[PDB]
mmCIF file of C-alpha atoms and ligand atoms in Angstrom:
data_model
loop_
_atom_site.group_PDB
_atom_site.id
_atom_site.type_symbol
_atom_site.label_atom_id
_atom_site.label_comp_id
_atom_site.label_asym_id
_atom_site.label_seq_id
_atom_site.Cartn_x
_atom_site.Cartn_y
_atom_site.Cartn_z
ATOM 1 C CA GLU A 26 -0.001 -0.005 -0.001
ATOM 2 C CA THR A 27 1.266 3.474 -0.913
ATOM 3 C CA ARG A 28 0.562 6.589 1.130
ATOM 4 C CA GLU A 29 -1.990 7.732 -1.478
ATOM 5 C CA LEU A 30 -4.073 4.541 -1.219
ATOM 6 C CA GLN A 31 -4.011 4.624 2.613
ATOM 7 C CA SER A 32 -5.390 8.200 2.647
ATOM 8 C CA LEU A 33 -7.985 7.642 -0.051
ATOM 9 C CA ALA A 34 -9.276 4.407 1.484
ATOM 10 C CA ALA A 35 -9.660 6.101 4.878
ATOM 11 C CA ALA A 36 -11.438 9.247 3.648
ATOM 12 C CA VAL A 37 -15.167 9.888 4.035
ATOM 13 C CA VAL A 38 -16.834 10.205 0.632
ATOM 14 C CA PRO A 39 -19.099 13.304 0.579
ATOM 15 C CA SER A 40 -22.441 13.134 -1.006
ATOM 16 C CA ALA A 41 -23.096 13.692 -4.706
ATOM 17 C CA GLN A 42 -24.824 16.983 -3.910
ATOM 18 C CA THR A 43 -21.865 18.236 -1.800
ATOM 19 C CA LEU A 44 -19.422 17.271 -4.616
ATOM 20 C CA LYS A 45 -21.547 18.948 -7.292
ATOM 21 C CA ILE A 46 -21.001 15.951 -9.637
ATOM 22 C CA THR A 47 -24.695 15.945 -10.700
ATOM 23 C CA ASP A 48 -24.356 19.367 -12.393
ATOM 24 C CA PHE A 49 -23.690 19.571 -16.134
ATOM 25 C CA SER A 50 -21.642 22.741 -15.334
ATOM 26 C CA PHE A 51 -19.146 20.899 -13.093
ATOM 27 C CA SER A 52 -15.490 21.920 -13.156
ATOM 28 C CA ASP A 53 -12.500 20.193 -11.613
ATOM 29 C CA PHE A 54 -10.041 23.113 -11.640
ATOM 30 C CA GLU A 55 -10.278 23.669 -7.876
ATOM 31 C CA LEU A 56 -10.032 19.913 -6.991
ATOM 32 C CA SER A 57 -6.932 18.085 -5.779
ATOM 33 C CA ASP A 58 -6.166 14.605 -7.142
ATOM 34 C CA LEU A 59 -7.500 13.090 -3.913
ATOM 35 C CA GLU A 60 -10.754 15.018 -4.338
ATOM 36 C CA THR A 61 -11.205 13.745 -7.908
ATOM 37 C CA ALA A 62 -10.692 10.213 -6.571
ATOM 38 C CA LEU A 63 -13.388 10.708 -3.981
ATOM 39 C CA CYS A 64 -15.727 12.126 -6.632
ATOM 40 C CA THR A 65 -15.086 8.972 -8.631
ATOM 41 C CA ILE A 66 -16.024 6.711 -5.686
ATOM 42 C CA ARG A 67 -19.215 8.658 -5.308
ATOM 43 C CA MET A 68 -20.124 8.090 -8.944
ATOM 44 C CA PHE A 69 -19.769 4.294 -8.570
ATOM 45 C CA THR A 70 -21.684 4.403 -5.302
ATOM 46 C CA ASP A 71 -24.664 6.480 -6.467
ATOM 47 C CA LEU A 72 -25.088 4.510 -9.614
ATOM 48 C CA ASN A 73 -25.401 1.508 -7.220
ATOM 49 C CA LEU A 74 -22.480 -0.272 -8.798
ATOM 50 C CA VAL A 75 -20.626 -0.792 -5.526
ATOM 51 C CA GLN A 76 -23.700 -2.581 -4.116
ATOM 52 C CA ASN A 77 -24.983 -4.443 -7.123
ATOM 53 C CA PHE A 78 -21.514 -5.870 -8.041
ATOM 54 C CA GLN A 79 -20.049 -6.326 -4.505
ATOM 55 C CA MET A 80 -16.940 -4.211 -4.938
ATOM 56 C CA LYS A 81 -14.515 -4.097 -2.017
ATOM 57 C CA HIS A 82 -13.724 -0.519 -0.981
ATOM 58 C CA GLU A 83 -9.961 -0.832 -1.074
ATOM 59 C CA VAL A 84 -10.181 -2.585 -4.488
ATOM 60 C CA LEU A 85 -12.224 0.266 -6.051
ATOM 61 C CA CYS A 86 -9.736 2.695 -4.406
ATOM 62 C CA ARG A 87 -6.683 0.901 -5.840
ATOM 63 C CA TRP A 88 -8.375 0.669 -9.251
ATOM 64 C CA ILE A 89 -9.164 4.393 -9.303
ATOM 65 C CA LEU A 90 -5.595 5.196 -8.401
ATOM 66 C CA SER A 91 -4.175 2.825 -10.982
ATOM 67 C CA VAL A 92 -6.336 4.436 -13.684
ATOM 68 C CA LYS A 93 -5.176 7.919 -12.594
ATOM 69 C CA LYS A 94 -1.510 6.909 -12.550
ATOM 70 C CA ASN A 95 -1.661 5.533 -16.112
ATOM 71 C CA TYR A 96 -2.570 8.956 -17.543
ATOM 72 C CA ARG A 97 0.384 11.211 -18.236
ATOM 73 C CA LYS A 98 0.421 14.450 -16.245
ATOM 74 C CA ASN A 99 2.796 16.046 -18.839
ATOM 75 C CA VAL A 100 0.091 15.933 -21.595
ATOM 76 C CA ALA A 101 -1.816 19.228 -21.519
ATOM 77 C CA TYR A 102 -5.331 17.990 -22.314
ATOM 78 C CA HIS A 103 -5.494 14.173 -22.689
ATOM 79 C CA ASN A 104 -4.730 13.391 -19.046
ATOM 80 C CA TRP A 105 -6.559 12.122 -15.939
ATOM 81 C CA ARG A 106 -8.571 15.346 -15.609
ATOM 82 C CA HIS A 107 -10.062 14.874 -19.056
ATOM 83 C CA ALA A 108 -10.961 11.259 -18.208
ATOM 84 C CA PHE A 109 -12.383 12.342 -14.855
ATOM 85 C CA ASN A 110 -14.499 15.004 -16.547
ATOM 86 C CA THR A 111 -15.730 12.605 -19.189
ATOM 87 C CA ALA A 112 -16.901 10.235 -16.424
ATOM 88 C CA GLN A 113 -18.531 13.106 -14.511
ATOM 89 C CA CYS A 114 -20.440 14.070 -17.658
ATOM 90 C CA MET A 115 -21.522 10.384 -17.957
ATOM 91 C CA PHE A 116 -22.734 10.459 -14.356
ATOM 92 C CA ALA A 117 -24.624 13.713 -14.860
ATOM 93 C CA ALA A 118 -26.278 12.478 -18.098
ATOM 94 C CA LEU A 119 -27.278 9.246 -16.335
ATOM 95 C CA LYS A 120 -28.778 11.072 -13.285
ATOM 96 C CA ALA A 121 -29.774 14.675 -14.160
ATOM 97 C CA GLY A 122 -30.087 13.686 -17.809
ATOM 98 C CA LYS A 123 -32.259 10.736 -16.727
ATOM 99 C CA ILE A 124 -30.449 8.330 -19.066
ATOM 100 C CA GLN A 125 -30.020 5.785 -16.175
ATOM 101 C CA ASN A 126 -33.444 4.248 -16.561
ATOM 102 C CA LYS A 127 -33.021 3.586 -20.304
ATOM 103 C CA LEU A 128 -30.022 1.259 -19.646
ATOM 104 C CA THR A 129 -29.157 -1.910 -17.817
ATOM 105 C CA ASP A 130 -26.923 -2.088 -14.760
ATOM 106 C CA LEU A 131 -24.199 -3.839 -16.748
ATOM 107 C CA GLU A 132 -24.339 -1.134 -19.423
ATOM 108 C CA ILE A 133 -24.002 1.626 -16.781
ATOM 109 C CA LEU A 134 -21.085 -0.232 -15.153
ATOM 110 C CA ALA A 135 -19.378 -0.553 -18.564
ATOM 111 C CA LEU A 136 -20.032 3.111 -19.539
ATOM 112 C CA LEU A 137 -18.538 4.497 -16.312
ATOM 113 C CA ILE A 138 -15.427 2.279 -16.557
ATOM 114 C CA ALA A 139 -15.015 3.108 -20.250
ATOM 115 C CA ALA A 140 -15.447 6.859 -19.618
ATOM 116 C CA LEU A 141 -12.592 6.816 -17.047
ATOM 117 C CA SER A 142 -10.373 4.541 -19.096
ATOM 118 C CA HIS A 143 -10.943 5.691 -22.714
ATOM 119 C CA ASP A 144 -7.762 7.868 -23.149
ATOM 120 C CA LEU A 145 -5.404 5.755 -20.953
ATOM 121 C CA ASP A 146 -1.687 6.363 -21.598
ATOM 122 C CA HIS A 147 -2.406 9.066 -24.241
ATOM 123 C CA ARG A 148 0.857 10.849 -25.190
ATOM 124 C CA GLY A 149 -0.732 13.918 -26.828
ATOM 125 C CA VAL A 150 -2.259 14.274 -30.305
ATOM 126 C CA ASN A 151 1.132 15.209 -31.833
ATOM 127 C CA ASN A 152 2.976 12.180 -30.443
ATOM 128 C CA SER A 153 3.235 9.148 -32.784
ATOM 129 C CA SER A 154 -8.582 2.910 -34.297
ATOM 130 C CA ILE A 155 -5.054 2.095 -33.265
ATOM 131 C CA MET A 156 -5.022 4.505 -30.340
ATOM 132 C CA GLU A 157 -8.378 3.385 -28.929
ATOM 133 C CA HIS A 158 -7.296 -0.261 -29.131
ATOM 134 C CA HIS A 159 -4.310 0.699 -27.026
ATOM 135 C CA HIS A 160 -6.506 2.552 -24.510
ATOM 136 C CA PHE A 161 -8.699 -0.518 -24.174
ATOM 137 C CA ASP A 162 -5.638 -2.803 -23.732
ATOM 138 C CA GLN A 163 -4.477 -0.540 -20.881
ATOM 139 C CA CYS A 164 -8.001 -0.562 -19.331
ATOM 140 C CA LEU A 165 -8.126 -4.378 -19.453
ATOM 141 C CA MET A 166 -4.575 -4.679 -18.003
ATOM 142 C CA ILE A 167 -5.667 -2.611 -15.005
ATOM 143 C CA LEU A 168 -8.969 -4.498 -14.501
ATOM 144 C CA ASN A 169 -6.901 -7.714 -14.327
ATOM 145 C CA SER A 170 -4.068 -6.457 -12.111
ATOM 146 C CA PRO A 171 -3.890 -7.998 -8.565
ATOM 147 C CA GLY A 172 -5.924 -5.962 -6.058
ATOM 148 C CA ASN A 173 -7.640 -3.897 -8.822
ATOM 149 C CA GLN A 174 -10.273 -6.410 -9.949
ATOM 150 C CA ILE A 175 -13.471 -4.335 -9.547
ATOM 151 C CA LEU A 176 -15.369 -6.771 -11.821
ATOM 152 C CA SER A 177 -14.533 -9.866 -9.682
ATOM 153 C CA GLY A 178 -18.075 -9.815 -8.314
ATOM 154 C CA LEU A 179 -19.587 -10.415 -11.742
ATOM 155 C CA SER A 180 -20.400 -13.912 -12.997
ATOM 156 C CA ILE A 181 -18.379 -15.004 -16.029
ATOM 157 C CA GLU A 182 -21.382 -14.355 -18.314
ATOM 158 C CA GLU A 183 -21.800 -10.832 -16.841
ATOM 159 C CA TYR A 184 -18.033 -10.389 -17.062
ATOM 160 C CA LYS A 185 -17.944 -11.198 -20.769
ATOM 161 C CA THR A 186 -20.898 -8.983 -21.586
ATOM 162 C CA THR A 187 -19.377 -6.082 -19.630
ATOM 163 C CA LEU A 188 -15.947 -6.396 -21.164
ATOM 164 C CA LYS A 189 -17.376 -6.314 -24.703
ATOM 165 C CA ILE A 190 -19.492 -3.185 -23.870
ATOM 166 C CA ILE A 191 -16.360 -1.504 -22.402
ATOM 167 C CA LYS A 192 -14.339 -2.299 -25.551
ATOM 168 C CA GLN A 193 -17.009 -0.977 -27.964
ATOM 169 C CA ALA A 194 -17.489 2.110 -25.781
ATOM 170 C CA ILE A 195 -13.756 2.920 -25.839
ATOM 171 C CA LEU A 196 -13.524 2.164 -29.591
ATOM 172 C CA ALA A 197 -16.488 4.543 -30.086
ATOM 173 C CA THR A 198 -14.380 7.470 -28.802
ATOM 174 C CA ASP A 199 -12.417 7.404 -32.146
ATOM 175 C CA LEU A 200 -13.925 10.509 -33.802
ATOM 176 C CA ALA A 201 -13.482 8.792 -37.193
ATOM 177 C CA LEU A 202 -15.880 6.011 -36.038
ATOM 178 C CA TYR A 203 -18.286 8.614 -34.689
ATOM 179 C CA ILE A 204 -18.410 10.413 -38.039
ATOM 180 C CA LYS A 205 -19.013 7.139 -39.848
ATOM 181 C CA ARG A 206 -21.797 5.985 -37.563
ATOM 182 C CA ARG A 207 -23.630 9.175 -36.548
ATOM 183 C CA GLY A 208 -25.472 9.513 -39.867
ATOM 184 C CA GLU A 209 -27.518 6.433 -39.045
ATOM 185 C CA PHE A 210 -28.270 7.784 -35.554
ATOM 186 C CA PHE A 211 -29.367 11.182 -36.913
ATOM 187 C CA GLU A 212 -31.394 9.396 -39.576
ATOM 188 C CA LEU A 213 -33.290 7.240 -37.054
ATOM 189 C CA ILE A 214 -34.008 10.275 -34.846
ATOM 190 C CA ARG A 215 -35.289 12.490 -37.674
ATOM 191 C CA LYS A 216 -37.680 9.684 -38.773
ATOM 192 C CA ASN A 217 -39.026 9.241 -35.178
ATOM 193 C CA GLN A 218 -37.809 5.609 -35.644
ATOM 194 C CA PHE A 219 -35.308 5.554 -32.772
ATOM 195 C CA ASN A 220 -35.903 2.587 -30.434
ATOM 196 C CA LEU A 221 -33.577 1.453 -27.629
ATOM 197 C CA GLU A 222 -35.182 -1.986 -27.298
ATOM 198 C CA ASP A 223 -33.438 -2.925 -30.593
ATOM 199 C CA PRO A 224 -29.938 -4.248 -29.710
ATOM 200 C CA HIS A 225 -28.372 -2.596 -32.783
ATOM 201 C CA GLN A 226 -29.703 0.845 -31.879
ATOM 202 C CA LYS A 227 -28.805 0.480 -28.212
ATOM 203 C CA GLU A 228 -25.194 -0.176 -29.121
ATOM 204 C CA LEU A 229 -25.348 2.827 -31.456
ATOM 205 C CA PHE A 230 -26.783 4.986 -28.643
ATOM 206 C CA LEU A 231 -24.002 3.883 -26.197
ATOM 207 C CA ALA A 232 -21.446 4.867 -28.815
ATOM 208 C CA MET A 233 -23.031 8.308 -29.315
ATOM 209 C CA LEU A 234 -23.251 8.856 -25.549
ATOM 210 C CA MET A 235 -19.515 8.136 -25.190
ATOM 211 C CA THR A 236 -18.755 10.768 -27.797
ATOM 212 C CA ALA A 237 -21.135 13.278 -26.109
ATOM 213 C CA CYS A 238 -19.312 12.821 -22.774
ATOM 214 C CA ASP A 239 -15.840 12.846 -24.396
ATOM 215 C CA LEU A 240 -16.589 16.202 -26.071
ATOM 216 C CA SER A 241 -18.512 17.756 -23.227
ATOM 217 C CA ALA A 242 -15.911 20.448 -22.333
ATOM 218 C CA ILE A 243 -17.516 22.290 -25.294
ATOM 219 C CA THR A 244 -20.788 22.514 -23.283
ATOM 220 C CA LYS A 245 -19.307 24.106 -20.121
ATOM 221 C CA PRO A 246 -19.883 27.693 -18.868
ATOM 222 C CA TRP A 247 -17.818 30.065 -21.021
ATOM 223 C CA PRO A 248 -14.986 30.763 -18.476
ATOM 224 C CA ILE A 249 -14.511 26.986 -18.055
ATOM 225 C CA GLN A 250 -14.793 26.244 -21.782
ATOM 226 C CA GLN A 251 -12.273 28.954 -22.648
ATOM 227 C CA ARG A 252 -9.755 27.454 -20.232
ATOM 228 C CA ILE A 253 -10.274 23.929 -21.529
ATOM 229 C CA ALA A 254 -9.838 25.274 -25.074
ATOM 230 C CA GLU A 255 -6.492 26.683 -23.922
ATOM 231 C CA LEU A 256 -5.345 23.214 -22.837
ATOM 232 C CA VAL A 257 -6.359 21.749 -26.219
ATOM 233 C CA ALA A 258 -4.451 24.506 -27.995
ATOM 234 C CA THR A 259 -1.401 23.825 -25.804
ATOM 235 C CA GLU A 260 -1.441 20.141 -26.664
ATOM 236 C CA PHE A 261 -2.042 20.741 -30.382
ATOM 237 C CA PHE A 262 0.720 23.338 -30.611
ATOM 238 C CA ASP A 263 3.267 23.410 -27.778
ATOM 239 C CA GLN A 264 2.953 19.624 -27.662
ATOM 240 C CA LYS A 265 -4.517 32.686 -31.737
ATOM 241 C CA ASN A 266 -5.908 34.794 -34.636
ATOM 242 C CA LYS A 267 -7.881 31.931 -36.214
ATOM 243 C CA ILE A 268 -8.786 30.038 -33.033
ATOM 244 C CA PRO A 269 -12.354 31.484 -32.667
ATOM 245 C CA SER A 270 -13.346 30.453 -36.212
ATOM 246 C CA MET A 271 -11.762 27.001 -35.674
ATOM 247 C CA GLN A 272 -13.836 26.605 -32.507
ATOM 248 C CA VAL A 273 -16.987 27.570 -34.325
ATOM 249 C CA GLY A 274 -15.975 25.114 -37.091
ATOM 250 C CA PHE A 275 -15.492 22.240 -34.582
ATOM 251 C CA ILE A 276 -18.803 23.011 -32.846
ATOM 252 C CA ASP A 277 -20.794 22.979 -36.091
ATOM 253 C CA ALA A 278 -19.135 19.960 -37.666
ATOM 254 C CA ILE A 279 -18.834 17.715 -34.599
ATOM 255 C CA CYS A 280 -20.801 18.815 -31.549
ATOM 256 C CA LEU A 281 -24.117 20.606 -32.200
ATOM 257 C CA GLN A 282 -25.943 17.811 -33.999
ATOM 258 C CA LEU A 283 -24.870 15.262 -31.418
ATOM 259 C CA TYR A 284 -26.212 17.272 -28.484
ATOM 260 C CA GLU A 285 -29.424 18.039 -30.430
ATOM 261 C CA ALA A 286 -29.868 14.318 -31.092
ATOM 262 C CA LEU A 287 -29.242 13.408 -27.418
ATOM 263 C CA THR A 288 -31.736 16.091 -26.292
ATOM 264 C CA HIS A 289 -34.292 14.281 -28.507
ATOM 265 C CA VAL A 290 -33.533 11.013 -26.724
ATOM 266 C CA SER A 291 -33.848 12.786 -23.371
ATOM 267 C CA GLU A 292 -35.087 16.340 -22.859
ATOM 268 C CA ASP A 293 -33.242 16.487 -19.530
ATOM 269 C CA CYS A 294 -29.902 16.515 -21.455
ATOM 270 C CA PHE A 295 -30.871 19.954 -22.908
ATOM 271 C CA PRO A 296 -28.286 21.784 -20.684
ATOM 272 C CA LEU A 297 -25.554 20.179 -22.754
ATOM 273 C CA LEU A 298 -27.079 21.485 -25.987
ATOM 274 C CA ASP A 299 -27.766 24.832 -24.325
ATOM 275 C CA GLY A 300 -24.171 25.149 -23.112
ATOM 276 C CA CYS A 301 -22.830 24.262 -26.565
ATOM 277 C CA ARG A 302 -25.072 26.863 -28.238
ATOM 278 C CA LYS A 303 -23.942 29.603 -25.785
ATOM 279 C CA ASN A 304 -20.320 28.739 -26.423
ATOM 280 C CA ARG A 305 -20.822 28.877 -30.190
ATOM 281 C CA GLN A 306 -22.230 32.432 -29.832
ATOM 282 C CA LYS A 307 -19.242 33.601 -27.770
ATOM 283 C CA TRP A 308 -16.724 32.091 -30.200
ATOM 284 C CA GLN A 309 -18.576 33.485 -33.207
ATOM 285 C CA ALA A 310 -18.616 37.005 -31.717
ATOM 286 C CA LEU A 311 -14.835 36.747 -31.210
ATOM 287 C CA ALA A 312 -14.443 35.310 -34.746
ATOM 288 C CA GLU A 313 -16.170 38.446 -36.077
ATOM 289 C CA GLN A 314 -13.593 40.696 -34.290
ATOM 290 C CA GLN A 315 -10.992 38.490 -36.117
HETATM 291 C C1 AJR B 19 -4.505 24.699 -32.289
HETATM 292 O O1 AJR B 19 -5.599 25.267 -31.636
HETATM 293 C C2 AJR B 19 -6.784 24.660 -31.831
HETATM 294 C C3 AJR B 19 -7.947 25.429 -31.897
HETATM 295 C C4 AJR B 19 -9.184 24.847 -32.121
HETATM 296 C C5 AJR B 19 -9.284 23.472 -32.298
HETATM 297 C C6 AJR B 19 -10.630 22.838 -32.522
HETATM 298 N N1 AJR B 19 -11.319 22.694 -31.283
HETATM 299 C C7 AJR B 19 -11.273 21.578 -30.503
HETATM 300 N N2 AJR B 19 -11.743 21.678 -29.246
HETATM 301 C C8 AJR B 19 -11.774 20.562 -28.433
HETATM 302 N N3 AJR B 19 -12.296 20.758 -27.209
HETATM 303 C C9 AJR B 19 -13.145 21.902 -26.902
HETATM 304 C C10 AJR B 19 -12.404 23.133 -26.482
HETATM 305 O O2 AJR B 19 -11.465 23.519 -27.452
HETATM 306 C C11 AJR B 19 -12.179 19.675 -26.191
HETATM 307 C C12 AJR B 19 -13.300 18.725 -26.368
HETATM 308 O O3 AJR B 19 -14.558 19.423 -26.503
HETATM 309 N N4 AJR B 19 -11.340 19.309 -28.784
HETATM 310 C C13 AJR B 19 -10.881 19.275 -30.038
HETATM 311 C C14 AJR B 19 -10.783 20.322 -30.949
HETATM 312 N N5 AJR B 19 -10.267 19.861 -32.156
HETATM 313 C C15 AJR B 19 -10.028 18.569 -31.911
HETATM 314 N N6 AJR B 19 -10.368 18.156 -30.644
HETATM 315 C C16 AJR B 19 -10.213 16.811 -30.083
HETATM 316 C C17 AJR B 19 -9.205 16.789 -28.924
HETATM 317 C C18 AJR B 19 -11.548 16.177 -29.718
HETATM 318 C C19 AJR B 19 -8.124 22.691 -32.244
HETATM 319 C C20 AJR B 19 -6.897 23.286 -32.045
HETATM 320 MG MG1 MG B 20 -9.203 9.191 -27.491
HETATM 321 ZN ZN1 ZN B 21 -11.322 11.734 -24.639
#
């Protein structure tokens, strides 16, 4: 046991309300590493995954700290804080967005693990679905490491189902796969034909939800979103004239239709769409002052 595991395992976990993890506007800038770990325990707990799958407290704690350690702190955007935020967006969409009741327990378990694990060992966009296969391999390696086996409570049939959902969810975070598959999702939604009871559409919806969470910095209150956009710029460049129009371009091409679609699946996800619209206005106004 390290010092960090001792302290995390012994801490009280504040409630979801106290931690503000149910809010689509959540920000981690003021949180220490230990506080993000406690937030992550609270997500597992309030989705009832600790109960329903009999996770030992110290095992969940070691797993969370192994995940965190296998992100690189030296990478400006694709690091533990991005993974932590993606998972918090998943938690908020499940709870405040009322997605929880559309999904099975095994799907929710797989979505939360995938959210936290989907960029593992990223070295920055400039450093040379190959990447997402590697993120999944890292995720599996951690799930199988001694003392980290948070899925040990599942039966082998549950285990196999969950692992395959995790893998598809992490593979879905490849934006090239999102662009190839979203047309079918938009098509089903515009024809009022979308139906989650169909396995094929369910898997499609889980893929889209992963992308919505992965991108969700774009939905945050403008001061937060501006700061996150700075991290992205740092990673893309360090490893400003045209940035506003590039942001508008990314919002239109990638984000707006996804959050509109998800609001059609669940009206309680509207704050994501609303936040993305408000950011597009701010960036456009700046783009017009070139
Ligand atoms: C050189 O400077 C710039 C300027 C603009 C862009 C375009 N905007 C992009 N913004 C963001 N985020 C929003 C805040 O910027 C984080 C996720 O929402 N992710 C992106 C972008 N382009 C690619 N990705 C991936 C990392 C998903 C790029 C690089
Ligand atoms: Mg990725
Ligand atoms: Zn990501």
